[PDB]
Amino acid sequence: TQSPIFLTPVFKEKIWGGTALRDRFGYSIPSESTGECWAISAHPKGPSTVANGPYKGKTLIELWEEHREVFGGVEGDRFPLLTKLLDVKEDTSIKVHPDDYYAGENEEGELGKTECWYIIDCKENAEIIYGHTARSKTELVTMINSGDWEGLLRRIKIKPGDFYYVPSGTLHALCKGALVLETQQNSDATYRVYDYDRLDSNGSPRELHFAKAVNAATVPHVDGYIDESTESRKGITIKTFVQGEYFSVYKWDINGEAEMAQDESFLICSVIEGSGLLKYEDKTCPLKKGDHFILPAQMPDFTIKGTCTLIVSHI
Ligand SMILES: [Zn+2]
């Protein structure tokens, strides 16, 4: 296809969620404790539906299975990624995501969940939990059992604009006061080790997966290294956050009119700030904060005019 494919958001309630998705993006949310917006999703538990054009109403799964041409004919049983907006009002659980092998073996073919975080906004003293100090799996087990979160967990102070890559196997948790654009593999495989003994809307504690978390966790933890790059042309500054095995993620900072080309299999796009006008051939497409869309394989060269910021990804 040759035109933008907009996606209608799906929402998920979370004990750590809030109303920021409605307050900052104008979204109609399910509850006053909404933690996640599954923005570009083909996950069975909450797939995005096409919001416009000839495919309006179809799910991203139906597009992947029946119209792979849209995605440049790339291989794979399922659309590979999942993009979310996260309203981390309170702390999320301490957890680890398995890799493709472990997930497939223990979660019935589910993909692993390597992911990354772009911090859109956050409070002044915001942090994240990333990595740990255990030198062996027996030590990790011991320190988790004595709830020595202070000696075990490693914390990183964050600020708006930060980017963190989270390889599967990484013990982590986003903490209270953060608004995040999370790009991850198409998976919902999560092993929690601690959830602060909280109760959900139904008065029941959330599930923990101690054994699986320890099995999936990388020990010892070693901080990986990613090199960012930035380049600018007329009307746009592009920051390249990562070009990894599972995805490449970028930030487009537009001011004025930028000339673009879609030279990948497809581009996943989220407008996180401002508004603008996308023009291609004789067509016009208004863009605004909160829009999520895919630019197909055959998308014609286009321009975006305005003051807006998008986070974009591709495989
Ligand atoms: Zn996570």
mmCIF file of all heavy atoms in Angstrom, residues 109-149:
data_model
loop_
_atom_site.group_PDB
_atom_site.id
_atom_site.type_symbol
_atom_site.label_atom_id
_atom_site.label_comp_id
_atom_site.label_asym_id
_atom_site.label_seq_id
_atom_site.Cartn_x
_atom_site.Cartn_y
_atom_site.Cartn_z
ATOM 1 N N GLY A 109 5.308 -20.636 22.738
ATOM 2 C CA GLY A 109 5.594 -19.933 21.501
ATOM 3 C C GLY A 109 5.579 -18.418 21.533
ATOM 4 O O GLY A 109 5.762 -17.771 20.494
ATOM 5 N N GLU A 110 5.337 -17.848 22.709
ATOM 6 C CA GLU A 110 5.327 -16.399 22.863
ATOM 7 C C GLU A 110 6.747 -15.926 22.546
ATOM 8 O O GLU A 110 7.709 -16.632 22.816
ATOM 9 C CB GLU A 110 4.996 -16.042 24.307
ATOM 10 C CG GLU A 110 4.831 -14.572 24.582
ATOM 11 C CD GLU A 110 3.427 -14.089 24.264
ATOM 12 O OE1 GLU A 110 2.621 -14.908 23.800
ATOM 13 O OE2 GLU A 110 3.131 -12.901 24.478
ATOM 14 N N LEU A 111 6.873 -14.739 21.963
ATOM 15 C CA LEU A 111 8.198 -14.191 21.666
ATOM 16 C C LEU A 111 8.832 -13.713 22.960
ATOM 17 O O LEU A 111 8.141 -13.537 23.974
ATOM 18 C CB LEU A 111 8.080 -12.989 20.719
ATOM 19 C CG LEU A 111 7.615 -13.195 19.279
ATOM 20 C CD1 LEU A 111 7.610 -11.845 18.541
ATOM 21 C CD2 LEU A 111 8.538 -14.172 18.579
ATOM 22 N N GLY A 112 10.143 -13.499 22.935
ATOM 23 C CA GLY A 112 10.814 -12.965 24.118
ATOM 24 C C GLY A 112 10.462 -11.482 24.170
ATOM 25 O O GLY A 112 9.724 -10.999 23.302
ATOM 26 N N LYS A 113 10.973 -10.741 25.145
ATOM 27 C CA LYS A 113 10.625 -9.319 25.220
ATOM 28 C C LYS A 113 11.802 -8.363 25.492
ATOM 29 O O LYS A 113 11.921 -7.778 26.570
ATOM 30 C CB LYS A 113 9.505 -9.096 26.260
ATOM 31 C CG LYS A 113 8.638 -7.818 26.148
ATOM 32 C CD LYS A 113 7.361 -8.070 27.032
ATOM 33 C CE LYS A 113 6.374 -6.954 27.142
ATOM 34 N NZ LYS A 113 6.877 -5.847 27.964
ATOM 35 N N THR A 114 12.690 -8.247 24.517
ATOM 36 C CA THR A 114 13.754 -7.255 24.602
ATOM 37 C C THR A 114 12.947 -5.969 24.337
ATOM 38 O O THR A 114 11.985 -5.995 23.564
ATOM 39 C CB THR A 114 14.789 -7.495 23.505
ATOM 40 O OG1 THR A 114 15.641 -8.566 23.930
ATOM 41 C CG2 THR A 114 15.641 -6.234 23.242
ATOM 42 N N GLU A 115 13.307 -4.864 24.987
ATOM 43 C CA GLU A 115 12.550 -3.627 24.827
ATOM 44 C C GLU A 115 13.425 -2.412 25.106
ATOM 45 O O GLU A 115 14.603 -2.537 25.422
ATOM 46 C CB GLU A 115 11.370 -3.626 25.801
ATOM 47 C CG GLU A 115 11.858 -3.744 27.250
ATOM 48 C CD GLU A 115 10.743 -3.794 28.264
ATOM 49 O OE1 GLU A 115 9.617 -4.154 27.893
ATOM 50 O OE2 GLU A 115 11.005 -3.472 29.445
ATOM 51 N N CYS A 116 12.846 -1.231 24.953
ATOM 52 C CA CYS A 116 13.586 -0.011 25.229
ATOM 53 C C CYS A 116 12.612 1.087 25.652
ATOM 54 O O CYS A 116 11.393 1.032 25.369
ATOM 55 C CB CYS A 116 14.424 0.394 24.009
ATOM 56 S SG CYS A 116 13.409 0.913 22.594
ATOM 57 N N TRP A 117 13.146 2.066 26.363
ATOM 58 C CA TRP A 117 12.340 3.152 26.886
ATOM 59 C C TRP A 117 12.836 4.520 26.481
ATOM 60 O O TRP A 117 14.035 4.809 26.584
ATOM 61 C CB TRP A 117 12.337 3.145 28.419
ATOM 62 C CG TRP A 117 11.848 1.915 29.047
ATOM 63 C CD1 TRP A 117 10.791 1.152 28.653
ATOM 64 C CD2 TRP A 117 12.372 1.306 30.235
ATOM 65 N NE1 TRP A 117 10.619 0.103 29.524
ATOM 66 C CE2 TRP A 117 11.579 0.173 30.504
ATOM 67 C CE3 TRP A 117 13.437 1.612 31.097
ATOM 68 C CZ2 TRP A 117 11.813 -0.662 31.598
ATOM 69 C CZ3 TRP A 117 13.674 0.781 32.194
ATOM 70 C CH2 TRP A 117 12.866 -0.343 32.434
ATOM 71 N N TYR A 118 11.919 5.346 25.997
ATOM 72 C CA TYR A 118 12.255 6.726 25.709
ATOM 73 C C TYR A 118 11.458 7.469 26.764
ATOM 74 O O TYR A 118 10.233 7.336 26.838
ATOM 75 C CB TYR A 118 11.782 7.197 24.329
ATOM 76 C CG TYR A 118 11.939 8.685 24.187
ATOM 77 C CD1 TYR A 118 13.210 9.251 24.046
ATOM 78 C CD2 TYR A 118 10.829 9.551 24.275
ATOM 79 C CE1 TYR A 118 13.378 10.639 24.004
ATOM 80 C CE2 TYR A 118 10.992 10.947 24.230
ATOM 81 C CZ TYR A 118 12.274 11.481 24.101
ATOM 82 O OH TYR A 118 12.470 12.856 24.133
ATOM 83 N N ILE A 119 12.146 8.248 27.594
ATOM 84 C CA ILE A 119 11.464 8.982 28.642
ATOM 85 C C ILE A 119 10.903 10.295 28.083
ATOM 86 O O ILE A 119 11.648 11.251 27.830
ATOM 87 C CB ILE A 119 12.422 9.297 29.806
ATOM 88 C CG1 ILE A 119 13.111 8.007 30.282
ATOM 89 C CG2 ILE A 119 11.654 10.009 30.937
ATOM 90 C CD1 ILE A 119 12.136 6.896 30.795
ATOM 91 N N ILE A 120 9.591 10.343 27.891
ATOM 92 C CA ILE A 120 8.977 11.545 27.358
ATOM 93 C C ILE A 120 9.025 12.633 28.425
ATOM 94 O O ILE A 120 9.435 13.761 28.152
ATOM 95 C CB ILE A 120 7.496 11.306 26.955
ATOM 96 C CG1 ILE A 120 7.409 10.241 25.848
ATOM 97 C CG2 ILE A 120 6.902 12.604 26.421
ATOM 98 C CD1 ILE A 120 6.006 9.621 25.691
ATOM 99 N N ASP A 121 8.625 12.284 29.643
ATOM 100 C CA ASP A 121 8.623 13.251 30.744
ATOM 101 C C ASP A 121 8.715 12.468 32.049
ATOM 102 O O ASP A 121 8.447 11.266 32.096
ATOM 103 C CB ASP A 121 7.323 14.067 30.718
ATOM 104 C CG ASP A 121 7.413 15.366 31.526
ATOM 105 O OD1 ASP A 121 8.475 15.664 32.104
ATOM 106 O OD2 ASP A 121 6.404 16.096 31.579
ATOM 107 N N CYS A 122 9.097 13.151 33.115
ATOM 108 C CA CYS A 122 9.219 12.490 34.401
ATOM 109 C C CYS A 122 9.449 13.551 35.454
ATOM 110 O O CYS A 122 9.838 14.676 35.136
ATOM 111 C CB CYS A 122 10.392 11.486 34.403
ATOM 112 S SG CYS A 122 12.079 12.155 34.270
ATOM 113 N N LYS A 123 9.201 13.187 36.704
ATOM 114 C CA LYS A 123 9.395 14.126 37.801
ATOM 115 C C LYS A 123 10.878 14.312 38.054
ATOM 116 O O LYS A 123 11.706 13.461 37.688
ATOM 117 C CB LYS A 123 8.704 13.629 39.074
ATOM 118 C CG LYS A 123 9.242 12.314 39.615
ATOM 119 C CD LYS A 123 8.599 11.975 40.952
ATOM 120 C CE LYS A 123 9.004 10.597 41.440
ATOM 121 N NZ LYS A 123 8.434 10.323 42.798
ATOM 122 N N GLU A 124 11.206 15.435 38.686
ATOM 123 C CA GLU A 124 12.581 15.781 38.996
ATOM 124 C C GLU A 124 13.436 14.670 39.622
ATOM 125 O O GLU A 124 14.576 14.471 39.208
ATOM 126 C CB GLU A 124 12.611 17.032 39.897
ATOM 127 C CG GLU A 124 14.008 17.426 40.408
ATOM 128 C CD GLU A 124 14.437 16.656 41.658
ATOM 129 O OE1 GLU A 124 13.755 16.783 42.701
ATOM 130 O OE2 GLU A 124 15.458 15.927 41.605
ATOM 131 N N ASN A 125 12.911 13.948 40.603
ATOM 132 C CA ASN A 125 13.719 12.902 41.241
ATOM 133 C C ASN A 125 13.399 11.480 40.770
ATOM 134 O O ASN A 125 13.605 10.509 41.510
ATOM 135 C CB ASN A 125 13.559 12.963 42.760
ATOM 136 C CG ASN A 125 12.133 12.717 43.200
ATOM 137 O OD1 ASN A 125 11.334 12.131 42.464
ATOM 138 N ND2 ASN A 125 11.805 13.150 44.411
ATOM 139 N N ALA A 126 12.901 11.361 39.542
ATOM 140 C CA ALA A 126 12.543 10.058 38.989
ATOM 141 C C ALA A 126 13.734 9.116 38.808
ATOM 142 O O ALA A 126 14.863 9.540 38.537
ATOM 143 C CB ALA A 126 11.809 10.244 37.640
ATOM 144 N N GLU A 127 13.464 7.824 38.959
ATOM 145 C CA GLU A 127 14.480 6.800 38.788
ATOM 146 C C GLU A 127 13.875 5.587 38.098
ATOM 147 O O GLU A 127 12.665 5.491 37.890
ATOM 148 C CB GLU A 127 14.996 6.282 40.132
ATOM 149 C CG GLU A 127 15.494 7.283 41.131
ATOM 150 C CD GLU A 127 15.922 6.579 42.419
ATOM 151 O OE1 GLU A 127 15.058 5.928 43.055
ATOM 152 O OE2 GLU A 127 17.117 6.664 42.781
ATOM 153 N N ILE A 128 14.753 4.653 37.769
ATOM 154 C CA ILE A 128 14.361 3.368 37.216
ATOM 155 C C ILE A 128 15.264 2.345 37.915
ATOM 156 O O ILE A 128 16.339 2.694 38.421
ATOM 157 C CB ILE A 128 14.583 3.265 35.685
ATOM 158 C CG1 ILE A 128 16.059 3.413 35.349
ATOM 159 C CG2 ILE A 128 13.713 4.299 34.978
ATOM 160 C CD1 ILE A 128 16.403 3.087 33.879
ATOM 161 N N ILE A 129 14.805 1.103 37.963
ATOM 162 C CA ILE A 129 15.586 0.008 38.523
ATOM 163 C C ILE A 129 16.092 -0.691 37.271
ATOM 164 O O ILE A 129 15.300 -1.046 36.390
ATOM 165 C CB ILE A 129 14.704 -0.945 39.341
ATOM 166 C CG1 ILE A 129 14.221 -0.228 40.598
ATOM 167 C CG2 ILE A 129 15.487 -2.200 39.710
ATOM 168 C CD1 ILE A 129 13.103 -0.949 41.327
ATOM 169 N N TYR A 130 17.406 -0.865 37.182
ATOM 170 C CA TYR A 130 18.028 -1.484 36.013
ATOM 171 C C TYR A 130 19.273 -2.271 36.422
ATOM 172 O O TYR A 130 20.320 -1.676 36.711
ATOM 173 C CB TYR A 130 18.440 -0.392 35.015
ATOM 174 C CG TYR A 130 18.936 -0.891 33.673
ATOM 175 C CD1 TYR A 130 18.099 -0.893 32.555
ATOM 176 C CD2 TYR A 130 20.254 -1.319 33.504
ATOM 177 C CE1 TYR A 130 18.566 -1.305 31.308
ATOM 178 C CE2 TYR A 130 20.735 -1.730 32.261
ATOM 179 C CZ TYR A 130 19.886 -1.718 31.167
ATOM 180 O OH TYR A 130 20.355 -2.102 29.941
ATOM 181 N N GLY A 131 19.160 -3.596 36.421
ATOM 182 C CA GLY A 131 20.286 -4.437 36.782
ATOM 183 C C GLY A 131 20.315 -4.760 38.263
ATOM 184 O O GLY A 131 19.468 -4.284 39.027
ATOM 185 N N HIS A 132 21.310 -5.549 38.671
ATOM 186 C CA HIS A 132 21.433 -5.961 40.065
ATOM 187 C C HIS A 132 22.883 -6.275 40.415
ATOM 188 O O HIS A 132 23.754 -6.284 39.550
ATOM 189 C CB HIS A 132 20.583 -7.198 40.314
ATOM 190 C CG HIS A 132 21.065 -8.399 39.566
ATOM 191 N ND1 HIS A 132 20.671 -8.682 38.275
ATOM 192 C CD2 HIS A 132 21.983 -9.336 39.897
ATOM 193 C CE1 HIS A 132 21.330 -9.742 37.842
ATOM 194 N NE2 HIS A 132 22.134 -10.156 38.806
ATOM 195 N N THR A 133 23.132 -6.570 41.685
ATOM 196 C CA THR A 133 24.498 -6.837 42.137
ATOM 197 C C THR A 133 24.857 -8.302 42.377
ATOM 198 O O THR A 133 26.011 -8.607 42.703
ATOM 199 C CB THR A 133 24.779 -6.101 43.458
ATOM 200 O OG1 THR A 133 23.823 -6.524 44.435
ATOM 201 C CG2 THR A 133 24.679 -4.596 43.265
ATOM 202 N N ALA A 134 23.888 -9.200 42.236
ATOM 203 C CA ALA A 134 24.143 -10.622 42.478
ATOM 204 C C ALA A 134 25.177 -11.189 41.524
ATOM 205 O O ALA A 134 25.141 -10.939 40.323
ATOM 206 C CB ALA A 134 22.855 -11.406 42.391
ATOM 207 N N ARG A 135 26.103 -11.969 42.072
ATOM 208 C CA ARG A 135 27.185 -12.552 41.292
ATOM 209 C C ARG A 135 26.903 -13.977 40.838
ATOM 210 O O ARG A 135 27.612 -14.520 39.980
ATOM 211 C CB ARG A 135 28.477 -12.505 42.118
ATOM 212 C CG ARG A 135 28.902 -11.085 42.506
ATOM 213 C CD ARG A 135 30.084 -11.098 43.480
ATOM 214 N NE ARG A 135 29.704 -11.597 44.800
ATOM 215 C CZ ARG A 135 30.564 -11.883 45.775
ATOM 216 N NH1 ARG A 135 31.867 -11.728 45.581
ATOM 217 N NH2 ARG A 135 30.123 -12.317 46.949
ATOM 218 N N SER A 136 25.871 -14.581 41.420
ATOM 219 C CA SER A 136 25.480 -15.936 41.077
ATOM 220 C C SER A 136 23.978 -16.076 41.259
ATOM 221 O O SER A 136 23.345 -15.292 41.977
ATOM 222 C CB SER A 136 26.202 -16.953 41.970
ATOM 223 O OG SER A 136 25.687 -16.906 43.284
ATOM 224 N N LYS A 137 23.387 -17.075 40.613
ATOM 225 C CA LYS A 137 21.958 -17.252 40.756
ATOM 226 C C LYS A 137 21.555 -17.656 42.176
ATOM 227 O O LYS A 137 20.454 -17.331 42.611
ATOM 228 C CB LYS A 137 21.431 -18.234 39.709
ATOM 229 C CG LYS A 137 21.566 -17.632 38.299
ATOM 230 C CD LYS A 137 20.431 -18.021 37.363
ATOM 231 C CE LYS A 137 20.582 -17.304 36.014
ATOM 232 N NZ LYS A 137 19.455 -17.629 35.095
ATOM 233 N N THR A 138 22.440 -18.328 42.914
ATOM 234 C CA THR A 138 22.098 -18.691 44.294
ATOM 235 C C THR A 138 22.022 -17.402 45.128
ATOM 236 O O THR A 138 21.147 -17.253 45.982
ATOM 237 C CB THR A 138 23.150 -19.640 44.931
ATOM 238 O OG1 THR A 138 23.223 -20.852 44.175
ATOM 239 C CG2 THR A 138 22.745 -20.005 46.353
ATOM 240 N N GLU A 139 22.937 -16.477 44.857
ATOM 241 C CA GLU A 139 23.001 -15.187 45.547
ATOM 242 C C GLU A 139 21.752 -14.351 45.211
ATOM 243 O O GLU A 139 21.160 -13.720 46.082
ATOM 244 C CB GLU A 139 24.270 -14.458 45.106
ATOM 245 C CG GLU A 139 24.617 -13.163 45.834
ATOM 246 C CD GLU A 139 26.037 -12.702 45.505
ATOM 247 O OE1 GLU A 139 26.995 -13.445 45.818
ATOM 248 O OE2 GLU A 139 26.214 -11.614 44.930
ATOM 249 N N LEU A 140 21.360 -14.350 43.942
ATOM 250 C CA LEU A 140 20.178 -13.612 43.525
ATOM 251 C C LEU A 140 18.980 -14.144 44.315
ATOM 252 O O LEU A 140 18.199 -13.372 44.899
ATOM 253 C CB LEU A 140 19.956 -13.803 42.019
ATOM 254 C CG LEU A 140 18.703 -13.142 41.426
ATOM 255 C CD1 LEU A 140 18.883 -11.632 41.491
ATOM 256 C CD2 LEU A 140 18.479 -13.607 39.969
ATOM 257 N N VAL A 141 18.847 -15.468 44.354
ATOM 258 C CA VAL A 141 17.751 -16.105 45.076
ATOM 259 C C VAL A 141 17.763 -15.703 46.549
ATOM 260 O O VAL A 141 16.728 -15.325 47.105
ATOM 261 C CB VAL A 141 17.838 -17.636 44.970
ATOM 262 C CG1 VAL A 141 16.945 -18.301 46.017
ATOM 263 C CG2 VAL A 141 17.410 -18.066 43.575
ATOM 264 N N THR A 142 18.938 -15.782 47.168
ATOM 265 C CA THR A 142 19.098 -15.425 48.575
ATOM 266 C C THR A 142 18.682 -13.975 48.852
ATOM 267 O O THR A 142 17.921 -13.704 49.778
ATOM 268 C CB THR A 142 20.564 -15.605 49.022
ATOM 269 O OG1 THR A 142 20.960 -16.966 48.814
ATOM 270 C CG2 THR A 142 20.728 -15.247 50.493
ATOM 271 N N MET A 143 19.186 -13.048 48.044
ATOM 272 C CA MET A 143 18.868 -11.640 48.222
ATOM 273 C C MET A 143 17.426 -11.274 47.938
ATOM 274 O O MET A 143 16.922 -10.284 48.472
ATOM 275 C CB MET A 143 19.790 -10.792 47.370
ATOM 276 C CG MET A 143 21.206 -10.904 47.818
ATOM 277 S SD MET A 143 22.316 -9.698 46.874
ATOM 278 C CE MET A 143 22.004 -8.105 47.921
ATOM 279 N N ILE A 144 16.754 -12.057 47.102
ATOM 280 C CA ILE A 144 15.356 -11.783 46.809
ATOM 281 C C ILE A 144 14.530 -12.307 47.977
ATOM 282 O O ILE A 144 13.559 -11.674 48.388
ATOM 283 C CB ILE A 144 14.877 -12.472 45.503
ATOM 284 C CG1 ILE A 144 15.521 -11.798 44.287
ATOM 285 C CG2 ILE A 144 13.355 -12.405 45.399
ATOM 286 C CD1 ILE A 144 15.134 -12.426 42.961
ATOM 287 N N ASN A 145 14.929 -13.462 48.513
ATOM 288 C CA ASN A 145 14.216 -14.065 49.636
ATOM 289 C C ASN A 145 14.281 -13.230 50.904
ATOM 290 O O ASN A 145 13.354 -13.253 51.705
ATOM 291 C CB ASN A 145 14.737 -15.479 49.933
ATOM 292 C CG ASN A 145 14.145 -16.519 49.008
ATOM 293 O OD1 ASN A 145 13.017 -16.370 48.543
ATOM 294 N ND2 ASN A 145 14.895 -17.586 48.743
ATOM 295 N N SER A 146 15.368 -12.495 51.100
ATOM 296 C CA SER A 146 15.472 -11.676 52.296
ATOM 297 C C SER A 146 15.010 -10.257 51.968
ATOM 298 O O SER A 146 15.176 -9.322 52.759
ATOM 299 C CB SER A 146 16.912 -11.683 52.835
ATOM 300 O OG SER A 146 17.815 -11.050 51.952
ATOM 301 N N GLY A 147 14.415 -10.116 50.788
ATOM 302 C CA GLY A 147 13.916 -8.827 50.352
ATOM 303 C C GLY A 147 14.925 -7.710 50.471
ATOM 304 O O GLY A 147 14.551 -6.568 50.723
ATOM 305 N N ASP A 148 16.203 -8.031 50.294
ATOM 306 C CA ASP A 148 17.261 -7.035 50.372
ATOM 307 C C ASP A 148 17.309 -6.278 49.051
ATOM 308 O O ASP A 148 18.308 -6.313 48.335
ATOM 309 C CB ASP A 148 18.607 -7.710 50.632
ATOM 310 C CG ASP A 148 19.754 -6.719 50.723
ATOM 311 O OD1 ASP A 148 19.503 -5.499 50.684
ATOM 312 O OD2 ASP A 148 20.918 -7.163 50.835
ATOM 313 N N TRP A 149 16.220 -5.588 48.735
ATOM 314 C CA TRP A 149 16.142 -4.835 47.489
ATOM 315 C C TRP A 149 17.170 -3.719 47.455
ATOM 316 O O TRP A 149 17.632 -3.318 46.389
ATOM 317 C CB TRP A 149 14.733 -4.269 47.323
ATOM 318 C CG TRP A 149 13.702 -5.330 47.415
ATOM 319 C CD1 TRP A 149 12.731 -5.453 48.365
ATOM 320 C CD2 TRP A 149 13.571 -6.466 46.557
ATOM 321 N NE1 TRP A 149 12.002 -6.599 48.156
ATOM 322 C CE2 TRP A 149 12.499 -7.241 47.051
ATOM 323 C CE3 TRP A 149 14.258 -6.906 45.420
ATOM 324 C CZ2 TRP A 149 12.096 -8.430 46.447
ATOM 325 C CZ3 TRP A 149 13.857 -8.084 44.819
ATOM 326 C CH2 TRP A 149 12.785 -8.836 45.333
#
